[PDB]
Amino acid sequence: SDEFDALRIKWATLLTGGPALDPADSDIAARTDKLAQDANDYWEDMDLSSSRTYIWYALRGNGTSDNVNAVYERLRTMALAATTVGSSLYGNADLKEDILDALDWLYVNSYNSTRSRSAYNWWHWQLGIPMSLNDTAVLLYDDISAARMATYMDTIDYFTPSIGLTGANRAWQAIVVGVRAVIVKDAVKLAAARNGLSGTGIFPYATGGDGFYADGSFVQHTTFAYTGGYGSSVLETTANLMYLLSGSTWSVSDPNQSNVWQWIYEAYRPLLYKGAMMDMVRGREISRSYAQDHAVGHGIVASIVRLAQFAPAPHAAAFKQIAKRVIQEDTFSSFYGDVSTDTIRLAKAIVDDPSIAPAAAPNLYKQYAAMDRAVLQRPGFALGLALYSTRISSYESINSENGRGWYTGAGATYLYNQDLAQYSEDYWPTVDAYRIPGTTVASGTPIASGTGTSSWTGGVSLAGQYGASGMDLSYGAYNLSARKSWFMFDDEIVALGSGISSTAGIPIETVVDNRKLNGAGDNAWTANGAALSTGLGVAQTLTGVNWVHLAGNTADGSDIGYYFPGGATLQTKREARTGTWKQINNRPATPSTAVTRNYETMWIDHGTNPSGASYGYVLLPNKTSAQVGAYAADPAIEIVVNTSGVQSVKEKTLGLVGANFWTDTTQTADLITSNKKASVMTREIADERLEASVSDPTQANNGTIAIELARSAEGYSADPGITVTQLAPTIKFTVNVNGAKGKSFHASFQLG
Ligand SMILES: [Ca+2]
Structure with a gap:
């Protein structure tokens, strides 16, 4: 053996669920039947003609990247139906043979170094198709010859030989090169995949452009909120890749990998509701029938479970707790119904573990x-x-x-x-x-x-x-x-x-x-x-x-x-x-x-x-x-002001007063007075304490926001960036919002 072989097998069970899979399991079975069904449903419709001009009539057109990519996933599905235990086609050699015949057929007839790495939707050529190809290689590794396995990996290395893009795309390159690196046993490329994770859009927080932000936001294509769309992908691939490399001489070392933990707590957790991943952060994917909010949510929770397999102790337990709570809350669509069989095996082990309590909501x-x-x-x-x-x-x-x-x-x-x-x-x-x-x-x-x-x-x-x-x-x-x-x-x-x-x-x-x-x-x-x-x-x-x-x-x-x-x-x-x-x-x-x-x-x-x-x-x-x-x-509500200059509402029962000041002129809303554009909220506990939070939503003020509250105080505590200049007769202070990037500053005053 060797590490490369051990890794290849780890990735195979990640795709298959390994030999452990218990077909007797009600949900594992269902997933299995569906696989075998869809699989042969294709196989028994393929054009096995020695002189075929296509492999699937409905997917003809060696030139349309969209169709080609689609035939590769087709194959992929058949490769899994022949590998996943419990499958109606587990072991079927003829199936395996047909798969390979179809593969080389596309090497000469379509996918090969004859095409350009620019052809419309380079994505399909450089990432999509090679992602399915690798998995087939891994699953059918044995049943593949030396030269055959070359026409496969050589062409992949052609379209995507290196990593150097943005967020989602960069991570896809990383797993595209990594996976083919272990099967071709190549430490240089493999080490390049591990290092890609440190690139922009992944591990390191971004202060502009694509990637994850310290406040937990996720951007893709420079100006679109995409935590549930592209973000979802970055999470999946990174988790999968980090899991593979985990425990090997290519394990991820970068200290920034810790940020990945926060993604879960800050970027995803708040955006999940009983199984669904909020559409407002999914971008154009809301228009996809196969990716509605709960299906998407399941994919994310699936990645949380994956993470729990190697993450450090503090975090792993936390990941299990969260996954458990979500899997239980979603009574709309069964989590096990649309995730990989290996994911089912792993989650099932968390859900039935009486020692794991669901995390609070x-x-x-x-x-x-x-x-x-x-x-x-x-x-x-x-x-x-x-x-x-x-x-x-x-x-x-x-x-x-x-x-x-x-x-x-x-x-x-x-x-x-x-x-x-x-x-x-x-x-x-x-x-x-x-x-x-x-x-x-x-x-x-x-x-x-x-x-x-x-x-x-x-x-x-x-x-x-x-x-x-x-x-x-x-x-x-x-x-x-x-x-x-x-x-x-x-x-x-x-x-x-x-x-x-x-x-x-x-x-x-x-x-x-x-x-x-x-x-x-x-x-x-x-x-x-x-x-x-x-x-x-x-x-x-x-x-x-x-x-x-x-x-x-x-x-x-x-x-x-x-x-x-x-x-x-x-x-x-x-x-x-x-x-x-x-x-x-x-x-x-x-x-x-x-x-x-x-x-x-x-x-x-x-x-x-x-x-x-x-x-x-x-x-x-x-x-x-x-x-x-x-x-x-x-009503517990009382509209303080609703004008072109300031909008303010008060919650009588909680002692809350919120106010948005729209202009850079001096304005007052109830007890609040501001001289600059701002968003302000205060909480008052009669003759005891006054709390205030302020932010510059414009993220363009490079000076301060002068606030004045209509109350007398005898003491205070505030976040750095806030200077209190008067405590009585009235409270006055300024907020240095230079480069605050929309964050909120807090301060609490004591009354008496
Ligand atoms: Ca209320």
Whole structure:
């Protein structure tokens, strides 16, 4: 033997689940049957003709990278069906033979050094195809000749001989070279793969461009929030590669590898809700039918389990606890149902281990300043907030994917409750893309893909417990500007809008919500205590409503209440919508099968060419119509100010006051006074203590923010960067936000 052989086998069991696999296992069996089925389902449809012009009729075209790549995965699947224990084709030599015949057939007929490393979608040629090829090599290593195994590895080394790209792509190169390095037994290349992990976009935090940030954000393609998309890939490949090298003379040494641990705690954990990976951080992938939020979540949790296999003691146990809690929480789609068999074996061992307790659920407010996102996690629900600015683009759409993502990150609110399927079950191809909840837009008209013109997008976090966010809106595709804010407290979220003006000559609207209902569309809902009709295809105007209650798709834990402080007039419609995935993802491999889902859509009509229009509403998750009614009578909320210059809301019961100052002029909101653009939040414990948090959301102030609180103090403690200059009669201090990059500064004052 030798290490190279031991590694190859470790990678084989990572793909197979090794000899240990227990087919008797209910979930392992299911995965196995499905494999064997799909596999031969192909095999018994291949063109085994000695003189074939293609291998699969539906995948003909040795020149279309998309099809070629697809035939390699096809093979890959057959290679696994012939290797995974419990498979209906385990051992079948003829299967193996056919696989190899097909391989060389493509060496001369398509994939070889005859092509350029530039051909459209170099990705397929340099990464995609060689990733499947390596795995086949590894699985069929034995059944392969010396020369045959050369036409394979030589061509791969051609397309991708070195590592030197960005994040996701760099990691793919790394595992592409690493894996082929162990099978070709080459220490130089293999050591190059280990070192690639230290490159930009991976281990080291990035202060610009692609990669992971210290605040836990993840960027790809320079301006897109992508933790759930490309981020997801970087996590998987890195975990897989680090696991292989782990324990060998090529093990990862770089001290930065520790950052990988934080990715889990800060970058992913807060963005997972009972199995789902929030769509707002998945980029254009939301348009992929095979990658909806829960499927994606499973892939991530799968990587957590992988990590737990070699991570240091403190972290590994933590990884097991988290994986266990997620696997148990997801009652929508079984985790074991869409992950590798080896992953099933490993997770099963964590879940049934009575010594491993599920980790507590996250309860917090996190401001991902570097990617314009924000999250609130509470016991019964979670809120995802997607914004954009001069730093982050509205949405991404390339290769004919996500053609309707216009408003996906333009002040969009995503509510997660017991209805775990809300954003799954073909939501994306059926939801009216022009009415994304939380947004303000010109009716039925889109916006362009790109970064905005305003720097003011971000928010403040009060000790990761509460927070407030804001977005200075100004579309480029058409005239419309507005000031939008959100204040997250304990059980409610207040959304405020002001300065809504436009000359576009198109009716402007703010969509309060657009929820997918049950299969019947009969969800009960009330307004001001009156039961409303539940029929499909009906559109009604609710005038002068103070509160609305919509019942969830689950018996408990998914109802949603809406309160309108000054009362309002809502435009609503409950309809059945039909659409296909091909409409938002025009690729050959995407399903054209039409699907129908039901929706209850509600919006505020601002009229045509409005000037200085405003709006205010509060989301009350998981409350009964009676609780919503009670709230609407004696509310815990009190709007302090909702102007073009400052938006502020107070939570009477918690003693919280949040405020977003939109201009560089002196303004005061309740007890708060600011001289510069800022996001501020305070908590007051009568005659005892006053807390304050401040941030410069613009990330452009290279001076300070002068704050003054209307209270008398006798002592204080503050984060560095804060200088207190007066404690009495009133509190005064400045915040050095030079290069703060959107972070929040905290200070606590003692009263008496
Ligand atoms: Ca409250």
